Design a binder for this molecule. Structure first.
Ligand SMILES: [Cl-]
Ligand SMILES: [Cl-]
Length: 134
C-alpha cells in the first residue's frame, strides 16, 4: 500500500509512535518518506552484504527479521523483532511499527538509519505533519 501523508501520520499516532523513546512523530514521518516514499511493499536488496531492507521503514534482515537468505549475525540476535521479513510487507503496518520500536530501543535510537541522519536530523521536519490534525 502507498499511504497518503496525513493518513500515515494519523495511523502512526494511534500506534503510539509520537515521542516513542523520545522520537517525535515528524521524525518517524521523515524517516518513512525517505526510506520508502510511504510504500509498505518496498524492498531493497544490498548486493554489497547480501541483506535486504523491507517495508515502509526499510528494516534490515541482518538483525531485525528472518528471511533465511541473509548471512547471519555470527552470534548476536539476527531476528531481534521475532518476525518473518514477510511480515514487514503487509498493508497493515502493526508489525512494522512494533519492529521499528524495537530497533530504536538500541543505543543508536533513530540514528540506526543513515537516511534519517542525511535527510531528517537537524532539519525543520514539521512539514511532514503539517495540517494532518495530529
Ligand atoms: Cl511473522
Ligand atoms: Cl521466520
Amino acid at each position: 500500500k502507498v499511504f497518503e501523508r496525513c493518513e500515515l501520520a494519523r495511523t502512526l499516532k494511534r500506534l503510539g509512535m509520537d515521542g516513542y523513546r523520545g522520537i517525535s512523530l515528524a521524525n518517524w514521518m521523515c524517516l518513512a518518506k525517505w526510506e520508502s516514499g510511504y510504500n509498505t511493499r518496498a524492498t531493497n536488496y544490498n548486493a554489497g552484504d547480501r541483506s535486504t531492507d523491507y517495508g515502509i521503514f526499510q528494516i534490515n534482515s541482518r538483525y531485525w527479521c528472518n528471511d533465511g537468505k541473509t548471512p547471519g549475525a555470527v552470534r548476536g540476535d539476527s531476528n531481534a523483532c521475532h518476525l518473518s521479513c514477510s511480515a514487514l510487507l503487509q498493508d497493515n503496518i502493526a508489525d512494522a511499527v512494533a519492529c521499528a520500536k524495537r530497533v530504536v530501543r538500541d543505543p543508536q535510537g533513530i540514528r540506526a538509519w543513515v537516511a534519517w541522519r542525511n535527510r531528517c536530523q537537524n532539519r525543520d521536519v514539521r512539514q511532514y505533519v503539517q495540517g494532518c490534525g495530529v
